[PDB]
Enzyme design. Structure first.
Site, PDB file in Angstrom:
ATOM      1  N   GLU A 237      -9.071  -4.881  -3.677  1.00 45.49           N
ATOM      2  CA  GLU A 237      -8.407  -3.788  -2.972  1.00 45.49           C
ATOM      3  C   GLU A 237      -9.360  -2.747  -2.374  1.00 45.49           C
ATOM      4  OE1 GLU A 237      -5.207  -3.853  -2.500  1.00 45.49           O
ATOM      5  OE2 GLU A 237      -4.157  -4.696  -4.232  1.00 45.49           O
TER       6      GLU A 237
ATOM      7  N   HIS B  54      -7.417  -5.577   0.887  1.00 45.09           N
ATOM      8  CA  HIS B  54      -6.241  -4.722   0.819  1.00 45.09           C
ATOM      9  C   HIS B  54      -5.353  -5.047   2.018  1.00 45.09           C
ATOM     10  CE1 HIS B  54      -4.010  -1.194  -0.413  1.00 45.09           C
ATOM     11  NE2 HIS B  54      -4.204  -0.567   0.734  1.00 45.09           N
TER      12      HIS B  54
ATOM     13  N   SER C 178       0.834  -1.196   0.000  1.00 45.27           N
ATOM     14  CA  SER C 178       0.000   0.000   0.000  1.00 45.27           C
ATOM     15  C   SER C 178       0.875   1.255   0.000  1.00 45.27           C
ATOM     16  CB  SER C 178      -0.932  -0.011   1.216  1.00 45.27           C
ATOM     17  OG  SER C 178      -2.031   0.857   1.009  1.00 45.27           O
TER      18      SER C 178
END
Ligand SMILES: *[C@@H]1O[C@H](CO)[C@@H](O)[C@H](O)[C@H]1NC(C)=O
Ligand SMILES: *[C@@H]1O[C@H](CO)[C@@H](O)[C@H](O)[C@H]1NC(C)=O
Ligand SMILES: *[C@@H]1O[C@H](CO)[C@@H](O)[C@H](O)[C@H]1NC(C)=O
Ligand SMILES: *[C@@H]1O[C@H](CO)[C@@H](O)[C@H](O)[C@H]1NC(C)=O
Ligand SMILES: [Cl-]
Ligand SMILES: [Cl-]
Ligand SMILES: [Cl-]
Ligand SMILES: [Cl-]
Ligand SMILES: [Cl-]
Ligand SMILES: [Cl-]
Ligand SMILES: [Cl-]
Ligand SMILES: [Cl-]
Ligand SMILES: [Cl-]
Ligand SMILES: [Cl-]
Ligand SMILES: [Cl-]
Ligand SMILES: [Cl-]
Ligand SMILES: [Cl-]
Ligand SMILES: [Cl-]
EC number: 3.1.1.7
Lengths: 532, 532
Positions: free
Chosen positions: B324, B437, B197
């Protein structure tokens, strides 16, 4: 005598024609208007002056002056659409096929030929109404109307060339049918007008125009709607094209009077020879002289009329073919050829997109390209070819018709929708073209019932089913027979939006015809083009 | 002693930790910068002053000050991401896991935690580097960096709060590794930085920034790229948010000096309490304080750097997860709930679209809606839910990463792309969220090898395969072992664009990851928004 009929315009003598081991009466070439010649060119039609004696209605009339397709000399696929009679400005006649013995008060169907408003004849073999009249026992009429500049040159403000006169020709023929069909055994209160392509757009235009509504009971639209992008132009654009036509003929452009005078002195072929030079864009599926939104035949914009319910409320039956765009791509898009599979490169795909949506800016073109491109296989020649085919068909015929059906159904009294996807076994056009623009007509007119034409048994069956759907709808407002054992063609409703396919397989009901692409063409793209 | 290491900054004493019936050395909480406290808040980090004596590196350090997720108290799914140590501005430390016996010159991997630049800790159980270090025999380092306003408040022009200091913290840790890892048995010329991320975006930012390039050999980016829409802001927007933060704290806004002085007097929690109030739009997947395109750390715009090849050219391994966007929809979009299937109505779908693409005008929103709506079944709650999930994931992670990979590969020396789509058998989050995610991390760090964690045998196998891919790539620049009998992860090339899925099924190679949607997000939409 069965072949002698006395009408309000005078007496007419038809001829006995053979049909499927039987016979019916045919009254061909009946005049319904004064010849629009000389100073009558471009002007509204005038009723045919009654005549003394007997009018010989034993042979087809002349075809209106028009551009003739010479792209494939000797090829029946294209030549079957060309005039099969001598061309003349003296062409406002109608034909009538009557069952034998003469009916008393039977269902009437009036055919309006298509041809992009630049061509068309009521006399084509594919429009021979004897099979339909005989088989379904209806009085079948085919009318005619001026096409090209002769029927649609528009110089709004002028009374000499007001525009829309071809549509007025159609109306006058409908008026004649209203006033005289009773004498041929037809019921004037049960008249169904039907037409294909420009003829379908016309049917829709009569549904809209206050001056035409009272002249028929119900309607059928095949591969065409009044709102098609090619079916009409603004008074401004119509005027621009009329002036440009004059410019092509070295006309004095100082005034409408001078321009019109000049155009009237030219021989018919002189106008036809430069007709295509007045288009504003490099495009396909765009024709020079078409109906104009004049504020008269059409009180206001087509969209405001559709939205407000300002149109005849009755039952309608309409539909489209699977590959409406293939014909025009063959004739004007790069990469397409009649004798090849026409696999298209990405380059030719892009060029085709621009020709198909001439009014779009670059952003608009990008939107269309993305909507129809499979980015996981963008160099697939077959996908590119079929994609362009879909773009042309969706933009020019299907989506405009779907917009019309959804708007109409809100106020109408009954809608029946079809999707014709049968590729005829004896088609002379290449396979890549699929189910071509105009090729459902031969089934509607029953050509497959003629053994010599080489159709399959399944195709004869499909034709009979289609003719019966059409005739039953004309007679009752519902293509389905009461208490029948056959599959039922469901009513198209605002909520379920059902339609059926028309082919040789057992009936299948579907919903929301090409809704994904049509939301793009009817909602998104217009919004994009207006915001940019 | 194996636990005693002398570095250029001073001596450090680690601790022997057990791991899978064996042991390895751990040096936890090594300082790499001076505590950024007091007048050092917002300012660039300064090297840690060498110390006398032995630094006790037996326990994890404090976590940086940050917003704490309290949305689901007592729920491990969310709490596993919160700080598990006491929070303090004195938080610039790094951790090192070293194989036993101590290596001489082995591959080094440096982990950069994610958390949208507003959260994150190097001490989370899911980041325990002992399994990876032990299993793959690499020296594994996890660094830390200031997040939120503390690490990214940006008042360009000022040297007291220039912005990007969190990125400079990362760089300083990388510098320390470059200068000292040799003493722990690591090879400073074979360092791979990897992160997820915001950590993945950071890795990409160091690839871009001239000041960071020389500090590592190769890189791995997980679910993040430097060009993500949430990963950076302009100097103007950064300044606007800093001022708005001050406004939320009743600060004197007459000058940067006054503003900064005020912000420095506030307790850490005071800044955190109003951090989310400075966002310009009602949105999701948008964070307040992030890297700024300053013309220093980033010479020019990210896009011009990518286009011109102005970045470190080496090998990279990167990828994304299947869903995600689900996490951020759960936390901020209407209709989503943790304990329901979250079937979304068309109304909530539209609302979600606006929250997901906050910068878009109405035309842009229409474009997105049409791109992700199945008009043949628009009221399907599951399709609407999954559609929004895809919009959020595609727009914020996948498409930006795909744009990065295609641009990078033109100048790079080797690209390996993956698509992680395995839903863990013991996931505590609802099924509708799918492959969340950040949930590939536990596999990268080898948690499935711990029996007590309840993973399946297949999941242990997947984890071992992933850890080996990562470590082999770090060691050689290719995740595949030379002359191996296992399926080969192919190189991603500009032409074939191949990638593989990462799950418990036999390897499958694919091409053009989500290319259809990404052409929309990377080419069409930006063009539309710029033209309107
Ligand atoms: C036209 O009518 C006449 C009758 O006067 C008839 O002999 C003729 O066959 C009809 N059509 C033709 C062939 O000209
Ligand atoms: C058509 O109109 C009649 C009333 O004239 C009404 O009874 C009938 O339900 C209508 N049919 C449809 C499908 O609208
Ligand atoms: C810190 O180092 C000391 C040695 O001085 C050691 O006794 C202690 O266990 C280490 N960590 C802790 C538990 O405080
Ligand atoms: C990487 O660079 C080397 C030369 O330094 C070259 O031999 C090799 O082909 C390159 N690999 C790729 C995939 O670009
Ligand atoms: Cl016959
Ligand atoms: Cl004029
Ligand atoms: Cl032109
Ligand atoms: Cl052309
Ligand atoms: Cl529609
Ligand atoms: Cl044919
Ligand atoms: Cl053929
Ligand atoms: Cl363990
Ligand atoms: Cl200021
Ligand atoms: Cl707001
Ligand atoms: Cl929110
Ligand atoms: Cl892309
Ligand atoms: Cl979990
Ligand atoms: Cl669950």
């Amino acid at each position: 005598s069965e072949l002698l009929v006395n009408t309000k315009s005078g007496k007419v003598m038809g001829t006995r024609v053979p049909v499927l081991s039987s016979h019916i009466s045919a009254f061909l070439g009946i005049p319904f208007a004064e010849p629009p010649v000389g100073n009558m060119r471009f002007r509204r039609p005038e009723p045919k002056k009654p005549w003394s004696g007997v009018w010989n209605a034993s042979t087809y009339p002349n075809n209106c002056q028009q551009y003739v397709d010479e792209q494939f000399p000797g090829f029946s696929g294209s030549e079957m659409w060309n005039p099969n009679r001598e061309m003349s400005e003296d062409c406002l006649y109608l034909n009538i096929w009557v069952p034998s013995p003469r009916p008393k008060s039977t269902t009437v169907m009036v055919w309006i030929y298509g041809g992009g408003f630049y061509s068309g004849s009521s006399t084509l073999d594919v429009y021979n109404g004897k099979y339909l009249a005989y088989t379904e026992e209806v009085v079948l009429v085919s009318l005619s109307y001026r096409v090209g500049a002769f029927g649609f040159l528009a110089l709004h403000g002028s009374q000499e060339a007001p525009g829309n006169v071809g549509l007025l020709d159609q109306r006058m023929a409908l008026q004649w049918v209203h006033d005289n069909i009773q004498f041929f055994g037809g019921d004037p209160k049960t008249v169904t007008i039907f037409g294909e392509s420009a003829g379908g757009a016309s049917v829709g235009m009569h549904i809209l125009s206050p001056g035409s509504r009272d002249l028929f009971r119900r309607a059928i639209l095949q591969s065409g709607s009044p709102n098609c992008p090619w079916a009409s132009v603004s008074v401004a654009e119509g005027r621009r094209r009329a002036v440009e036509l004059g410019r092509n003929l070295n006309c004095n452009l100082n005034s409408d009077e001078e321009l019109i005078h000049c155009l009237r002195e030219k021989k018919p072929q002189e106008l036809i020879d430069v007709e295509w030079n007045v288009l504003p864009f490099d495009s396909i599926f765009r024709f020079s002289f078409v109906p104009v939104i004049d504020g008269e035949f059409f009180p206001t914009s087509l969209e405001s009329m559709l939205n407000s319910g300002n149109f005849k409320k009755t039952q309608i039956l309409l539909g489209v073919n699977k590959d409406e765009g293939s014909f025009f791509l063959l004739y004007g898009a790069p990469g397409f050829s009649k004798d090849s599979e026409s696999k298209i490169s990405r380059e030719d795909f892009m060029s085709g997109v621009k020709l198909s949506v001439p009014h779009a800016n670059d952003l608009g073109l990008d939107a269309v390209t993305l909507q129809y491109t499979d980015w996981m296989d963008d160099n697939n020649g077959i996908k590119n070819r079929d994609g362009l085919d879909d773009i042309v068909g969706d933009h020019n015929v299907i989506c405009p018709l779907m917009h019309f059906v959804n708007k109409y159904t809100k106020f109408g009294n009954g809608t029946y929708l079809y999707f014709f996807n049968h590729r005829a076994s004896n088609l002379v056009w290449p396979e890549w073209m699929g189910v071509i623009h105009g090729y459902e007509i031969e089934f509607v007119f029953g050509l497959p019932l003629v053994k010599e034409l080489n159709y399959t048994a399944e195709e004869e069956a499909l034709s009979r089913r289609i003719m019966h759907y059409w005739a039953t709808f004309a007679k009752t407002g519902n293509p389905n027979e009461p208490h029948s054992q056959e599959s039922k063609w469901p009513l198209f409703t605002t909520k379920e939006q059902k339609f059926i396919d028309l082919n040789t397989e057992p009936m299948k009901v579907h919903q929301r015809l090409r809704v994904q692409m049509c939301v793009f063409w009817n909602q998104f793209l217009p919004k994009l083009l207006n915001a940019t």
